[PDB]
Design an enzyme around this catalytic site. Structure first.
Site, short mmCIF file in Angstrom:
data_model
loop_
_atom_site.label_atom_id
_atom_site.label_comp_id
_atom_site.label_asym_id
_atom_site.label_seq_id
_atom_site.Cartn_x
_atom_site.Cartn_y
_atom_site.Cartn_z
N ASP A 1 -7.79 14.13 31.67
CA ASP A 1 -7.63 12.87 32.38
C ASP A 1 -7.02 13.15 33.74
OD1 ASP A 1 -8.49 11.22 30.13
OD2 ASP A 1 -6.68 12.07 29.17
N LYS B 1 0.82 -1.20 0.00
CA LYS B 1 0.00 0.00 0.00
C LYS B 1 0.86 1.25 0.00
CE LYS B 1 -4.04 -2.24 1.93
NZ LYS B 1 -3.52 -3.45 2.63
MN LIG Z 1 -7.03 12.10 27.21
MN LIG Z 2 -9.61 10.60 28.51
#
Ligand SMILES: [Mn+2]
Ligand SMILES: [Mn+2]
Ligand SMILES: [Mn+2]
Ligand SMILES: [Mn+2]
Ligand SMILES: [Mn+2]
Ligand SMILES: [Mn+2]
Ligand SMILES: [Mn+2]
Ligand SMILES: [Mn+2]
Ligand code: NA
Ligand code: NA
EC number: 2.7.7.7
Length: 326
Positions: free
Chosen positions: A183, A63
């Site tokens: 996060d 590819k």
């Molecule tokens: Mn994140």
């Molecule tokens: Mn996250």
DNA sequence: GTCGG
DNA sequence: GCTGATGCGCG
DNA sequence: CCGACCGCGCATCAGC
């Protein structure tokens, strides 16, 4: 971005195999090829040169040869103009819609953001929230906003209890100038590996963050992980900030270093490290690093005082969070 | 799809 | 009504 | 060739 043309096509091929083909291992194989090419310090001049890398086999070198020859890839042209493939791919951009729901919607004729509005009643709570903030969730977070986000959570968190410790992780911890979401790793002395009862820890932090109108929606909630939406306070009601995905993760204090290593990522790095842990006789999760027995059973957790302690266990030279964006 | 066994 | 297989998700 | 391919949290609903 020396080989971004190649890595862009491999990523779109990985996404195709996840969302449409429901082949997680072909998705993973392409991502691993893409991550390895992203790491190669020479401009790839042919598929043969790419095949030398671990992760690039015959079909991908094929590819790449086609892509460098023609600037395109026929397989991807087919996928982009296939009504089902592209509609399925599109729906998976909504949070809560994965490959199964996407395929089922498209089989029912539900195939554009408007169509999901007409059938709002066919979406679970998570999907309905992902449709509500569809655009906002695709906007990146400038690190400048992340820093104000970090300051708000940290302050609210220990306005609940002095002993909390909140570490913002993910891409922000790796020094990314902009992040996909937020996060947050959470710990407390009263929740360790041998702790009992408790779990009113995440809730009080989440509730406090709701009481100040920072968290605005909830996707899922449990005694250790929270997934929801947040928003920086509007500056005297003058063009509000985009709504943002937040993830809060509550880890036992004595397990903070495995937890912060996992939550700092990146995901491909985590996958590469845990595989490498496996070859040298260890199994790494977000709680423990455990030795591998002769058979296959995992042993008792090994003592961990640092992120580096885990790297040394597996004979990996420590890499700083900035160098973890694999 | 890949590569070690 | 219950639940565990399935789905979606986190890094 | 062939099969393994990190590890785990929470929500939903088909089949009872
Ligand atoms: Mn994140
Ligand atoms: Mn996250
Ligand atoms: Mn329509
Ligand atoms: Mn209120
Ligand atoms: Mn991610
Ligand atoms: Mn290795
Ligand atoms: Mn259950
Ligand atoms: Mn095979
Ligand atoms: Na290769
Ligand atoms: Na999705």
């Amino acid at each position: 971005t020396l080989n971004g043309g190649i890595t862009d096509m491999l990523t779109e091929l990985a996404n195709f195999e996840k969302n449409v083909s429901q082949a997680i291992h072909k998705y993973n194989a392409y991502r691993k090829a893409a991550s390895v090419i992203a790491k190669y310090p020479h401009k790839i001049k042919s598929g043969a040169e790419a095949k030398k890398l671990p992760g690039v086999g015959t079909k991908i070198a094929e590819k790449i040869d086609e892509f460098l020859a023609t600037g395109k890839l026929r397989k991807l042209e087919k996928i982009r103009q296939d009504d089902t493939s592209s509609s399925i791919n599109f729906l998976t951009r909504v949070s809560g819609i994965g490959p199964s729901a996407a395929r089922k919607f498209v089989d029912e004729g539900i195939k554009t953001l408007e169509d999901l509005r007409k059938n709002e009643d066919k979406l679970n709570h998570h999907q309905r929230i992902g449709l509500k903030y569809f655009g906002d969730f695709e906007k990146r977070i400038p690190r400048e906003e992340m820093l104000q986000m970090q300051d708000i959570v940290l302050n609210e968190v220990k306005k609940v209890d002095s002993e909390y410790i909140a570490t913002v992780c993910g891409s922000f911890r790796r020094g990314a100038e902009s992040s996909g979401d937020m996060d947050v790793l959470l710990t407390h002395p009263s929740f360790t590996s041998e702790s009992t009862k408790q779990p009113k820890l995440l809730h009080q932090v989440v509730e406090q963050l709701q009481k100040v109108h920072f968290i605005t929606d909830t996707l899922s909630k449990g005694e250790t992980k929270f997934m929801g939406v947040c928003q920086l306070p509007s500056k005297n009601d003058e063009k509000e900030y985009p709504h943002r995905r937040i993830d809060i993760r509550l880890i036992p204090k004595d397990q903070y270093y495995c937890g912060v290593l996992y939550f700092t990522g990146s995901d491909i790095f985590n996958k590469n490290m845990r595989a490498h842990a496996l070859e040298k006789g260890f199994t790494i999760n977000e709680y423990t690093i455990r030795p591998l027995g002769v058979t296959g059973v995992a042993g008792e957790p090994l003592p961990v005082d640092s992120e580096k302690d885990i790297f040394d266990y597996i004979q990996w030279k420590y890499r700083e969070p900035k160098d973890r964006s694999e």
